[PDB]
């Protein structure tokens, strides 16, 4: 069957880009995000003139920091300028852009030795490392495919979908022929196993799995009703206003606009885009909370409404005996350390919500009401 | 307007590091960047002819030129030389 | 592989000594590698690393400590001056593939080693 999302008025498109606007003009190292820049040209959307800048800006700072910095970027967010370039219609190309390719590509190689066992990334990072490369039709060895290709322990919608994507473009561009049919039994089964993780409510796990989940679903042909109901279940949470982190629009905007990843094969740099054009009285109290370590710390912090986690956590290490790093990331600050406790190897610090229910936001993102307890977990994955 | 690390490109007017200007490749939207120019390897590796980087024998004819010389592809289509 | 320390042994204050990061199965040019100390009671802290393609120290060991690679072997020395107490702890080495200009001092590095203990009164 056929999975279809209709069409739409300019309005919940164009707001839900508003959210994007400003991140334009924010070209630090720091939060330079190719992942923004694909969603823009992938979309219905676009920024003018600023969006050459922005290009420019990636160009600089990647090609200077990893072909000459402060850290970084990252091989996966190298990955995703890969697919900023196709989203301009280029082909990574010449002595800097040969270089960058062998680069991710030895990335893909560590990652593989270390399998041997889990990768030090992600499995998510591996597959988006091999779709970038299979975008600009440089080829990797079977062995690599093949660590993916066993992957599908347990994984979220994000890692099959994005293998899928990596699998989905290992066929149409009939690379690594010796695995053929296997990419299509992998591809067979990671659709499969999508549409089991749909919630009640009509989501491929989350709301945030849902983009790319579609994406993925979106290039190969129960399919439609899972698909109808996928749309309902989208377009509720819009209007409820759940996207407003930068990454996450930017991985839905696109299909919004009827396309996916998959469309970088053959980019479409001309169709015309439209242009995107630009306090409380309240103090709340929230109860931010830590039960990993001994004694646990359990604390009332008031700050006013409408504050993120983030804000709640500065407050707290303001009055006194709380502290918490954080690290950047596409998606914004991500929790490293609490209370000089940093995540180890195959650990997180998970952020959850009363009762007991993880949080589908950062601490940038998500906004407690008044009374609601926030915890930091070690947990391990 | 280019602070004084870097080369601005005459019709972009995007300002690009003078590690870019005369390298072959063309990074200015017009090319004036190019313009008025002028240890061991381990056991399934190999060693690019001219330089000191070790690829795995796998890069070898792959399509893809991994070594700085493209060495790795020289002799792809021909037994041997 | 993995990778293994040596060179570590007591000494007094004031001494010399030489840790050596001798690593088996790593391609030469294209890993990050680290030292790492670890005191009793105390967390892992980074001390000096050298790049993959330049070299970054942690100024507590500003003119103190210095890193180097034997070009035959495949090994990372931290060659240890102007010995103190509190430089007392085992030392760890580690290989990471971050092709980022630098290497960091950050305790984010892939592959670790067993570490050699350094002890001094």
């Known amino acids: 069957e056929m999975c279809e999302i209709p069409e739409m008025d300019s309005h919940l498109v164009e707001k839900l880009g508003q959210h994007l606007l400003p991140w334009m003009d924010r070209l630090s190292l720091e939060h330079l995000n190719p992942s923004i820049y694909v969603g823009l040209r992938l979309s219905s959307l676009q920024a003018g003139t600023k969006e050459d800048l922005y290009l420019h800006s990636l160009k600089l700072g990647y090609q200077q920091c990893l072909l000459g910095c402060q850290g970084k970027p990252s091989m996966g967010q190298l990955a995703l300028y890969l697919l900023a370039l196709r989203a301009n219609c280029e082909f990574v190309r010449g002595h800097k852009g040969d270089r960058l390719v062998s680069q991710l590509k030895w990335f893909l190689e560590d990652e593989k030795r270390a399998i041997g066992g889990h990768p030090h990334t992600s499995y998510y990072q591996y597959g988006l490392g091999i779709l970038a490369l299979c975008l600009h039709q440089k080829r990797v060895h079977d062995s690599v495919v093949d660590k993916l290709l066993y992957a599908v322990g347990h994984h979220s919608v994000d890692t099959a979908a994005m293998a899928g994507l990596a699998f989905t473009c290992l066929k149409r561009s009939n690379f690594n022929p010796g695995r053929r049919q296997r990419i299509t039994m992998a591809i067979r089964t990671v659709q499969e196993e999508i549409l089991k993780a749909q919630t009640p409510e009509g989501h491929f796990g989350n709301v945030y799995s849902t983009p790319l989940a579609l994406q993925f679903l979106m290039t190969s042909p129960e399919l439609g009703t899972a698909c109808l109901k996928a749309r309902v279940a989208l377009l509720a949470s819009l209007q409820d206003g759940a996207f407003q982190n930068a990454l996450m629009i930017s991985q839905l905007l696109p299909v919004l606009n009827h396309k996916t990843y998959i469309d970088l094969i053959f980019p479409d740099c001309l169709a015309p885009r439209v242009m995107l054009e630009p306090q409380t009285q309240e103090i709340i109290s929230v109860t931010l909370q830590v039960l990993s370590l001994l004694p646990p710390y359990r604390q009332s912090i008031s700050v006013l409404a409408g504050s993120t986690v983030e804000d709640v956590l500065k407050k707290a290490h303001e009055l006194g005996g709380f502290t918490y790093e954080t690290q950047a990331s596409l998606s914004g600050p991500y929790l490293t350390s609490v209370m000089g406790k940093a995540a180890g190897e195959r650990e997180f610090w998970q952020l959850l919500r009363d009762p007991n229910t993880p949080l589908l936001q950062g601490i940038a993102d998500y906004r407690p009401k008044d009374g609601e307890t926030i915890e930091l977990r070690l947990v391990s994955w | 307007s280019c602070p004084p690390t870097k080369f601005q490109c005459r019709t972009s007017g995007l300002c690009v590091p003078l590690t870019w200007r005369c390298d072959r490749d063309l990074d200015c939207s017009d090319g004036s960047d190019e313009e008025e120019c002028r240890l061991a390897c381990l056991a399934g590796e190999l060693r690019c002819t001219l330089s000191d980087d070790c690829i795995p024998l796998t890069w070898r004819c792959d399509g893809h030129p991994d070594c700085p010389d493209s060495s790795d592809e020289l002799g792809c289509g021909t037994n041997e030389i | 592989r993995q990778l293994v320390e040596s060179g570590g042994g007591l000494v007094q204050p004031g001494g010399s000594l030489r840790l050596s990061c001798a690593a088996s199965g790593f391609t030469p040019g294209i890993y990050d590698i680290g030292w790492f100390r670890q005191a009793p009671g105390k967390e892992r802290e980074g001390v000096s690393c050298i790049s993959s393609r330049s070299t970054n120290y942690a100024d507590s060991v500003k003119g103190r400590f210095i890193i180097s690679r034997d070009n035959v072997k495949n090994t990372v020395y931290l060659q240890m001056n102007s010995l103190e107490p509190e430089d007392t702890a085992v030392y760890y080495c580690?290989?990471?593939?971050?092709?980022?200009?630098?290497?960091?001092?950050?305790?984010?590095?892939?592959?670790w080693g067993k570490g050699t203990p350094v002890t001094v009164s």
């Open positions: 580690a290989a990471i593939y971050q092709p980022s200009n630098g290497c960091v001092l950050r305790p984010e590095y892939s592959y």
